Amino acid sequence: KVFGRCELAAAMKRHGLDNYRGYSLGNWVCAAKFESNFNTQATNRNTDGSTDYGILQINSRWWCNDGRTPGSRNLCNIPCSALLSSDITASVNCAKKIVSDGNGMNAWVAWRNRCKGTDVQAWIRGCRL
């Protein structure tokens, strides 16, 4: 599913991402835009053989099992395919674990390079939140 911007904002808010670990909703929407273009089915192979999955491009190196990332972990205790669902629950729950792990949203390289220090509030402007 390809979310609308405000549609995704509303779902992220309902699932408790607004101000989670101090990150305002616009941070999460901006991250999703540049990670996946709001597409839950987005996948991307990393150089090390791991793969990023879903609207927040969660990596199989640490967070989910895809059966083809040798030596990797599954810290969210989910198949990576769960991260491709039209329902964003699994991605949100796993994102909460990632953002809590020490480096905050710097875990998402696209957030660090394209969202951090920008006017992220712009990403939720106009939405009935």
Instruction: Find which of Na ion, Rh ion, Cl ion, none residue 51 binds, CB within 5 to 8 Å per kind.
Output: none
The only residue of 69, 78, 83, 91 in contact with Cl ion, by rule CB under 5 A: 69
Tell me: is residue 18 an annotated ligand-binding position: no
Residue 33, H or E segment: helix 25-36
104 lines the binding site for Cl ion (CB under 5 A):
yes
The answer to whether the beta carbons of residues 61 and 50 sit under 8 Å apart is: yes
Q: Which does 5 bind (CB under 5 to 8 A by kind): Na ion, Rh ion, Cl ion, none?
A: Cl ion
Options 5, 61, 97, 116; binder of Cl ion; rule CB under 5 A = 5
Residues composing the chain: 129
Stretch that binds Cl ion, among 10-18, 51-59, 89-97, 119-127 (CB under 5 A): 119-127
Ranges within 22-41 binding Cl ion (CB under 5 A): 24, 26
Assess 51 for contact with Cl ion (CB under 5 A).
Answer: no
Q: Which residue has the tokens 């949100």?
A: 92
Q: How far is CA 72 from the centre of its chain?
A: 19
**Which residues would be at the binding site for Na ion (CB under 5 A)?**
60, 65, 69, 72, 74
Binding region for substrate: 101
